[PDB]
Amino acid sequence: TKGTSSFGKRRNKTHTLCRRCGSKAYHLQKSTCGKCGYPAKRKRKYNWSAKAKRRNTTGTGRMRHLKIVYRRFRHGFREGTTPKPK
Amino acid sequence: NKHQIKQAVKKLYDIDVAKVNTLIRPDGEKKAYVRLAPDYDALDVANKIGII
């Protein structure tokens, strides 16, 4: 009665997708994530898990703005000009 | 929405419109059913568009 039959009353979801994190942890009654701490400004990040850090870092997704900063440093953050015409 | 849609067809196909109805498919694409005023025929206008 604590096994197979107690697994038939499961129809009531606890967690749900976050709005900052993508993952499925947003506790509804309690209104926190459990992987990002959403409604707080600061990110949940503990140092007792190397793996848990390295899945979301600065170097993991697209970096759609840093990728060019690296290209612009290489010449000196020039702007406001053009090469020679033809 | 329905107002934008209505004005657009009047500005493209040079036509007049009674009403529209909308739905959103399971592919996430939105669709419209547009009824013309009885003065205008649809078989007519469909060939100007170039569609049967």
């Binding site: 997708l17 499925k24 | 592919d27 996430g28």
Partner: protein
């Protein structure tokens, strides 16, 4: 569930398009190794993250 929300409905839709077979013209390129998808999903097995 017949009373869905707009976020949920976008989410499912992608997964549906993302579960189709592979084209045959891909099998003929130079550096191709791909024989089949092996990332497919069948409603009665392998449920979703949701």
């Amino acid at each position: 569930s017949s009373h869905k929300t707009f976020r949920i409905k976008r989410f499912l839709a992608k997964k549906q398009k993302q579960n189709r077979p592979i084209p045959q013209w891909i099998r003929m390129k130079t550096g191709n190794k791909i024989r089949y998808n092996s990332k497919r999903r069948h409603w009665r097995r392998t449920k979703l993250g949701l």
